[PDB]
Design a binder for this molecule. Structure first.
Ligand code: CHL
Ligand code: CLA
Ligand code: CLA
Ligand code: CLA
Ligand code: CLA
Ligand code: CLA
Ligand code: CLA
Ligand code: LHG
Ligand code: LUT
Ligand code: LUT
Ligand code: LUT
Ligand code: GG0
Lengths: 219, 192, 165, 41, 207
């Protein structure tokens, strides 16, 4: 209860005890007052953070490599159109449907794990692979086939440290992807281009000069 | 056991009396006894078919009859397949139908037996009767040769996905110029 | 062209209506001196009218037989033809904002219902509590769906008064 | 000022101030963003 | 306390005397967690040893470049070392480097997760093992006497060489030429030639 909070002076809400990774007591809208809704929101936070970490990596590492003359990857916002003009390009609707079908199969299993944490581990499910879906008792942290290197499964507090690192990195990358979307919506340049322009003149190059954030009607 | 996969490690308890066991299961896929029981037969079956496939590709390339990739290429384009110069007037539909019927019959009449009988049978499959008289090290040899054959077959697939040449042609080119003709030199394996 | 309607960017009657409005305002202009306050007011009105007509032509609205913008209230028919801002996007906006207000009022009712005098709290509103619940009502859809899945949003019929048929 | 703020918290004062601030916000929205027929983003 | 007089050792650097170069320097307290401190000690040994090897290579090759011993192989700048043809191209060199360093570093990590479990080779030969990051690779035997002092000398040289390589990359990205040439150009005046008079370091001066 004495952990650092999102406001030194504001006590944590009674539904945020401190057990969850990354619980800084931040819930001013009280969205997680229901415990089952809180568990669903924790799983949603894990999924959004992991997908944002993957997406932000796939944005900022190829863009940086293009900046230093490696691989030469186009802008992330126009990378869909760059591939869609290829001579052997899969059509957009067909590719989306294939991705959605595979993700349907995978994430309905993940959903059933969210309900009962030991769902998919029952015998006779797969073809001998059901043993890898035992889970660790907390949904969103499967283990088994996932986590091959077995990082953190040694001292329990080692896994809690890695859980906090994961949740902070996921939140940072979610904020970063929101920044990427808003930066490209306002300025037709990449995230590294926006960063380089800001270092040229921080008082001149920012969100108050794109003309899209602050509306021109007010000023 | 003979081996431990890593030189120094904790060993899974369910991988000791198994032939050709090195304790290699970091994912823990065979923690359940039924999972191990099915996966053992799966590994034996995969190794046997991989040995058959590796023998097929090596014998189709070194005997000078063609490439393994180009085997079903003349199956369309009009028709007429090739096997030792035989005309074989079978089209694509009848060939697939006969193969499906044969495989369905063989596999249905196969995997309806006992767990030991599904993977390790006798009768007409060992006519010379040398399964008797120390079968553990022979099983170990079978599993190890099967693993080597699976590695060879997946290497053939990945190599033809990469450079796109023949297996023995790529081997000859690698022996001729080991500097610029490796897996690393083409722009598909090492991007940096 | 979604239902026999032409875009107002190319429909002639839209330009005719804009010209008629600007000409009427110019007829109003032609009575004062150039720099008078009525002249500035009429110039501002003209600028607003031209900006409105140019914006309506820019946004891609549909005009009918004459130059009046028409809105499409069918999803799909407005999504694939690019007129979701006519009805669909304001539908989502109203649903969100009305749910915010209604959920804030609901949570105020259930918060003051379990007090000493719920009668007094509805004419004498606890302003900090109302402000807090108005802020919390911005996450109304997720909260409402969670309470619906929990079953705490609706009341059992056996605890609700009815008439004796 | 407890009684004065309680009077300010009474239903008519609060509803008149609330409709006043809402109407003023909408009016200034139409002042800076006039003739918004559709939600064109 | 050793790194800073009138300062107190950060608790977890006090009771553990068996650390090479334990001078109490941890103001940000990175290794309060004992497992984190073990990881950071292994990272110390690895970074220090690779930096000693790297800085010795830079200094020796630049000495041979400035004086002149080797042929066209040694007559190139260290940052331009890839211009030579050598014996193998880039891709296969990087590939075999990946393979054999995977082998060696996985042996090292297998030692890390269980000390002494990986000292035996399939040939049957066995070696002695001591401590954790000190696997007893001592053929001519200088470890039998005052091993703490030798470890302290090693860790001091390792820290000096990590600082050296940080200096090498910073100088190279700041001023042109070889690091020995940069040292000589410093020694020229030396009141003017230093890191302030670069136009790339202070930024407050020369825009
Ligand atoms: C184990 C699986 C296996 C499979 C799926 C194939 C499949 C094939 N091989 Mg074969 N092979 C296989 C093993 C082997 N091949 C060869 C040696 C060859 C040669 C030399 C040639 C083929 C060719 C062919 C193709 C012609 C069709 C065929 O074989 O018809 C079914 C086979 C028969 C009807 C004969 C069965 C004889 C058996 C009962 C005794 C085909 C795609 C031909 C090809 O297309 O070359 C370009 C060809 O010329 N194979 C050897 C000896 C090393 C093998 C195993 O040891
Ligand atoms: C979940 C996160 C994510 C997502 C959605 C994407 C999405 C995309 N990436 Mg990306 N990437 C990511 C993470 C991600 N990446 C990460 C973490 C890295 C490493 C930092 C990269 C590095 C990377 C590079 C270098 C490139 C892309 C490219 C692309 C685009 C085309 C990929 C393609 O051709 O089809 C899918 C690719 C496949 C290999 C399909 C898999 C099926 C194969 C055949 C099986 C494997 C055998 C696409 C929009 C390319 C691009 O920009 O297009 C021009 C490209 O150059 N990515
Ligand atoms: C409020 C009720 C309502 C009504 C009366 C309509 C009516 C219509 N819709 Mg629609 N739709 C609705 C709700 C409604 N929709 C909602 C809530 C959604 C969001 C899921 C959609 C999404 C949608 C799409 C994506 C499409 C339509 C389309 C259509 C038109 C053709 C339907 C057809 O082919 O025959 C009847 C179909 C039967 C199954 C019977 C039609 C006039 C199509 C269109 O745009 O017309 C060109 C089109 O593709 N709708
Ligand atoms: C926030 C309070 C509140 C809430 C949550 C509801 C909710 C509901 N009302 Mg109701 N209503 C209210 C206040 C409220 N009403 C008031 C004050 C009146 C008197 C004018 C009415 C008169 C009324 C009638 C006659 C009917 C409903 C009906 C309904 C239901 C249909 C949906 C609807 O919006 O209808 C429309 C709602 C209105 C027209 C009234 C809205 C008045 C304002 C906007 C709400 C009050 C705001 C409140 C002061 C905010 C407090 C904030 C808090 C932080 C302090 C729905 C569940 C209908 C129904 O029974 O459906 C089956 C119906 O027939 N309402
Ligand atoms: C329910 C019927 C209805 C509907 C759907 C509309 C809809 C609309 N009216 Mg209208 N109006 C109505 C009734 C209605 N009106 C009535 C009864 C009158 C007589 C008093 C008027 C008089 C009127 C005038 C004089 C004008 C409009 C205008 C507008 C448009 C402006 C949109 C806007 O404000 O930007 C967007 C607003 C927001 C994004 C704010 C939303 C968030 C707020 C802060 C929440 C508020 C909390 C409560 C819009 C399409 C204006 C226009 O130009 O028409 C095109 C305008 O000049 N109306
Ligand atoms: C472990 C450090 C190290 C490494 C990796 C190398 C590596 C190399 N040296 Mg070198 N060398 C070193 C230390 C090192 N040297 C030291 C300390 C000295 C001083 C005694 C020399 C003096 C030296 C000379 C004089 C020459 C090399 C040459 C070479 C290159 C080819 C050697 C050859 O093929 O035979 C000899 C090649 C002949 C043409 C004869 C090669 C890349 C040769 C070279 O630079 O290639 C042109 C060369 O002639 N070295
Ligand atoms: C100036 C840009 C640049 C950069 C950034 C690199 C980077 C790298 N080179 Mg390369 N190289 C360059 C230019 C560059 N090179 C040039 C100009 C040439 C000659 C033309 C070469 C020729 C060359 C060869 C021949 C080889 C390399 C290799 C390597 C890798 C070292 C192996 C390793 O790190 O272990 C492995 C890494 C890990 C186990 C973990 C990944 C790294 C993470 C991020 C942790 C590392 C921390 C990080 C370094 C510290 C932060 C940055 C710090 C500088 C502030 C490395 C990633 C070697 C290689 O490919 O690997 C064997 C290799 O053999 N380079
Ligand atoms: C859903 C998929 C619909 C996309 C069809 C694309 C048609 C052409 C693309 C096109 O018409 O232009 C973009 C279109 C709206 O842009 P507008 O045409 O209004 O832009 C022009 C004016 O706004 C500027 O003057 O966006 C949409 O398609 C619908 C928005 C998604 C709805 C969001 C709701 C999410 C819930
Ligand atoms: C806490 C709380 C509670 C209280 O009570 C209240 C409040 C305040 C409300 C709160 C807050 C919240 C928030 C902040 C939220 C946010 C979120 C996000 C941002 C997410 C994202 C998230 C995000 C995500 C997933 C993302 C992902 C991404 C991706 C995949 C990407 C992809 C890609 C790439 C690679 C590149 C290419 O070329 C393109 C693409 C294809 C595009
Ligand atoms: C154990 C484990 C456990 C832990 O825990 C984890 C992990 C790591 C995951 C693991 C591992 C795994 C792996 C490695 C796997 C792999 C496999 C393989 C490779 C297979 C192949 C496999 C392979 C195979 C079958 C192959 C086969 C082949 C064939 C048939 C061929 C055929 C043919 C021929 C003759 C020739 C002609 O002209 C063509 C054709 C007709 C085509
Ligand atoms: C303690 C602490 C704690 C507290 O609390 C906080 C703080 C303050 C943060 C801290 C501190 C820290 C630091 C200072 C760190 C640093 C490190 C380093 C510098 C490393 C390096 C490290 C470094 C390294 C490894 C390096 C290495 C190098 C090398 C290999 C090189 C190589 C080479 C050669 C030979 C030659 C050729 O031609 C080129 C090349 C290829 C280039
Ligand atoms: N009862 C047959 C059976 O269990 N088959 C499993 C397999 O396909 O290996």
């Amino acid at each position: 209860a004495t952990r650092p909070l999102w406001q030194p002076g504001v006590e944590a809400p009674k539904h945020l005890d401190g057990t969850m990774p990354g619980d800084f007591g931040f819930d001013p809208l009280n969205l997680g007052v229901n415990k089952e809704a809180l568990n669903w929101y924790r799983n949603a936070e894990l999924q959004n953070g992991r997908w944002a970490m993957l997406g932000v990596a796939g944005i900022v590492i190829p863009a940086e490599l293009t900046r230093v003359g490696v691989l030469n990857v186009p802008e992330w916002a126009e990378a869909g159109k760059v591939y869609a003009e290829s001579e052997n390009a899969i059509p957009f609707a067909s590719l989306l449907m294939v991705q959605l079908f595979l993700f349907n199969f995978v994430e309905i299993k993940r959903w059933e794990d969210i309900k009962k944490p030991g769902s998919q581990a029952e015998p006779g499910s797969f073809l001998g692979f059901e043993s890898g879906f035992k889970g660790t008792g907390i949904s969103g942290y499967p283990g088994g086939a996932f986590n091959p290197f077995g990082l953190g499964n040694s001292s329990k507090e080692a896994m809690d440290d890695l859980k906090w690192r994961e949740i902070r990195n996921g939140r940072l990358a979610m904020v970063a992807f929101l920044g990427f979307l808003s930066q490209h919506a306002a300025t037709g340049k990449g995230p590294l281009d926006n960063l380089a322009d800001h270092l040229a003149d921080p008082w001149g190059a920012n969100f108050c000069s794109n003309g899209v954030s602050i509306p021109s009607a007010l000023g | 056991k003979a081996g431990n996969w890593l030189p120094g490690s904790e060993t899974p308890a369910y991988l000791e009396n198994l032939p050709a066991s090195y304790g290699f299961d970091p994912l823990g896929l065979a923690a359940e006894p039924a999972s191990l029981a099915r996966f053992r037969e799966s590994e034996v079956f995969h190794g046997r078919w991989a040995m058959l496939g590796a023998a097929g590709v090596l014998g189709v390339e070194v005997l000078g009859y063609g490439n393994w990739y180009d085997a079903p290429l003349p199956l369309v384009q009009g028709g007429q397949a090739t096997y030792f110069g035989a005309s074989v007037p079978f089209d694509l539909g009848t060939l697939a139908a006969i193969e499906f019927a044969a495989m369905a019959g063989a596999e249905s009449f196969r995997g309806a037996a006992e767990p030991e009988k599904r993977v390790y049978p006798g009768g007409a499959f060992d006519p010379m009767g040398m399964s008797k008289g120390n079968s553990k090290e022979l099983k170990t040899k079978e599993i190890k040769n099967g693993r080597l054959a699976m590695l060879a077959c997946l290497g053939f697939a990945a190599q033809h996905a990469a450079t796109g040449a023949s297996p023995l042609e790529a081997l000859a080119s690698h022996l001729a110029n080991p500097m610029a003709v490796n897996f690393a030199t083409n722009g598909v394996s090492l991007p940096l | 062209d979604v239902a026999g309607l032409t875009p107002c960017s190319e429909s002639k009657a839209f330009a005719k209506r804009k010209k008629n409005e600007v000409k009427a305002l110019n007829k109003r202009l032609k009575n004062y001196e150039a720099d008078s306050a009525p002249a500035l007011a009429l110039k501002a009105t003209i600028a607003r009218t031209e900006a409105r007509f140019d914006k309506y032509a820019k946004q891609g609205l549909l005009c009918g037989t004459d130059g009046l913008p028409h809105l499409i209230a069918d999803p799909g028919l407005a999504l694939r033809y690019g007129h979701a801002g006519d009805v669909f996007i304001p539908t989502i906006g109203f649903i969100y904002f009305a749910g915010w207000l209604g959920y804030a009022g609901s949570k105020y009712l259930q918060a003051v219902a379990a007090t000493a005098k719920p009668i007094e709290k509805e004419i004498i509103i606890d302003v900090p509590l109302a402000w807090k619940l108005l802020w919390e009502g911005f996450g109304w859809p997720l909260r409402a769906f969670a309470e619906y899945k929990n079953g705490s949003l609706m009341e059992d019929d056996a605890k609700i008064t009815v008439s004796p048929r | 000022m407890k009684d004065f703020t309680t009077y300010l918290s009474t239903a008519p004062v609060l509803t008149l101030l609330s409709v006043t601030v809402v109407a003023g916000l909408l009016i200034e929205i139409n002042r800076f963003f006039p003739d918004a027929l559709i939600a064109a983003f | 306390a050793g790194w800073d007089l009138s300062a107190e050792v950060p608790a977890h650097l006090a009771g553990r005397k068996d650390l090479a170069g334990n001078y109490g320097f941890d103001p940000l307290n990175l290794g309060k967690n004992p497992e984190a401190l073990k990881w950071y000690q292994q990272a110390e040994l690895q970074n220090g040893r690779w930096a000693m090897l790297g800085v010795a290579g830079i200094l020796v090759q630049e000495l041979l470049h400035s004086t002149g011993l080797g042929g066209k192989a040694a007559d190139v700048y260290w940052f331009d070392a890839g211009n030579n043809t050598f014996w193998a191209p880039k891709e296969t060199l990087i590939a075999i480097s990946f393979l054999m360093f995977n082998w060696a570093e996985l042996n090292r990590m297998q030692d890390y997760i269980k000390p002494g479990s990986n000292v035996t080779d399939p040939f049957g030969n066995k070696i002695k093992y001591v401590e954790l990051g000190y696997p007893g690779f001592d053929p001519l035997s200088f470890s039998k006497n005052n091993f703490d002092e030798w470890k302290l000398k090693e860790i001091k040289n390792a820290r000096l060489a990590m600082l050296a390589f940080l200096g090498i990359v910073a100088q190279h990205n700041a001023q042109p030429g070889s690091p020995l040439e940069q040292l000589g150009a410093h020694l020229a005046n030396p009141w003017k030639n230093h890191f302030i008079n670069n136009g790339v370091s202070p930024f407050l001066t020369d825009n």
